[PDB]
A paper describes a structure:
We solved the X-ray structure of the apo MLK3 SH3(44–103) domain at 1.5-Å resolution and refined it to an Rwork/Rfree of 18.6%/21.7%. The residues that extend the MLK3 n-Src loop form a 310 helix, which is not commonly present in SH3 domains. Comparison of the unbound and ligand-bound structures of MLK3 SH3 domain revealed a closed and open conformation of the n-Src loop, respectively. As modeled in Fig. 5B, the closed conformation of the loop precludes the peptide from the groove.
MLK3, also known as MAP3K11, is a serine/threonine protein kinase involved in regulating the JNK, p38, and ERK pathways. It is composed of several modules: an SH3 domain, a kinase domain, tandem leucine zippers, a Cdc42/Rac interactive binding (CRIB) motif, several linker regions, and a proline-rich C-terminal tail. The SH3 domain has been implicated in the autoinhibition of the kinase domain through an intramolecular interaction via a nonconsensus single proline motif located between the leucine zipper and CRIB motif in the full-length MLK3 protein. The overall structure reveals a five-stranded antiparallel β-barrel, a characteristic of all known SH3 domains, and three loops (RT, n-Src, and 310 helix), commonly involved in the recognition of both proline-rich and nonproline ligands.
Author numbering: 41 to 102
Write the structure that this text describes.
């Protein structure tokens, strides 16, 4: 059911609230709302067994 989003790039977290990404990970995107991520241009999601925020430009739909 949940839409497919793919990490375009590696992302190394700067905090425990940030999601680590590796290029080509399928990322479960949980919100695009800045009021939920707390940081304009950041989304919330789950990958790697962690939930957290990442910069929105790091994933693409499909």
């Amino acid at each position: 059911h949940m839409p497919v989003w793919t990490a375009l790039f590696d992302y190394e977290p700067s905090g425990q609230d940030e999601l680590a990404l590796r290029k080509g990970d399928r990322v479960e995107v949980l919100s695009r709302d800045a009021a939920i991520s707390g940081d304009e241009g950041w989304w919330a999601g789950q990958v790697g067994g962690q939930v957290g925020i990442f910069p929105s430009n790091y994933v693409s739909r499909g």
